[PDB]
Design a binder for this molecule. Sequence first.
Ligand SMILES: Cn1nn[nH+]c1CC(=O)N[NH3+]
Ligand code: NI
Ligand code: NI
Ligand SMILES: [Zn+2]
Length: 330
Amino acid sequence: AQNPNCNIMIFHPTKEEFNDFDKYIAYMESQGAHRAGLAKIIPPKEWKARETYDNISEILIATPLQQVASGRAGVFTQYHKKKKAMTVGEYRHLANSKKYQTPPHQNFEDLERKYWKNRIYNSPIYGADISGSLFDENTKQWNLGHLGTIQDLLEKECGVVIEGVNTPYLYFGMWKTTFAWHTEDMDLYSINYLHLGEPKTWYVVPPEHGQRLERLARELFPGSSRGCGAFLRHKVALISPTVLKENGIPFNRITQEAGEFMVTFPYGYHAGFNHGFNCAEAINFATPRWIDYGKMASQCSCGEARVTFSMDAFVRILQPERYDLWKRGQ
Ligand SMILES: Cn1nn[nH+]c1CC(=O)N[NH3+]
Ligand code: NI
Ligand code: NI
Ligand SMILES: [Zn+2]
């Protein structure tokens, strides 16, 4: 078996290898990459996502979200408070202000220490789930707006045509903005490209051990667990690496820098934080190997995690017994 310790693998495709997206994901899996839950892909030196980022300041962030924490430093939840609209240029200036800017630090380890020590005491603002793309139309390789759609994958694999679409999203981050522990909707894959700015640190549990994280989360967030059998789908819970280690949860960590892709694999729980002002683009995707994960994916039906109407068909087709109850959630 490849990659038995479930380490995060890093890939360096050549420009020839970067032509066929699906073929390369399959190659990474052949080497055991999915066992970690997460992989890093560094693009060939000849590739570029777009010519410059000099003209992105007028993009609007319609609903910036202030991420307010409750709990303790290593075990906390966050809720999102809506703020007034601001442009990307306005947001950048805010992220760089004295109130929000990254503190002085020695290296990524020292900043990680400061994140986990002090996160709960601040409420950073972030731009999320902004439909759009910053890839140039003429970037032909690994353009996140041009990948096979999940609908088309389901049709190709299972024979039925369904409604829905699958487009990318933009994320604007600042120091301490946080992504809570979760898997993707329907336990899909994700791909994430860090366009511009400061890094993003990631934490990931191997898919084979996801239920260990779930069990710990039910112990650490008992009221939430009583409220919903799939509360992690609410995307509000954080557990620090120190608490994970104390509890024996297998995980790994890695820092993504601008110009790098990260791929999350089905049922790979992940969480993380931004080092400073940055912009990422992400989209969910499927492969044939996903179908079995989508059939088994847990669902939130308490109401709290509402999602894409594109997800309706996936539940309807892959999980017909659950459909009725889930549809009520939405
Ligand atoms: C969103 N996003 N963009 N880059 N990284 C992320 C975090 C994530 O949860 N991806 N699935
Ligand atoms: Ni396009
Ligand atoms: Ni994710
Ligand atoms: Zn729920």
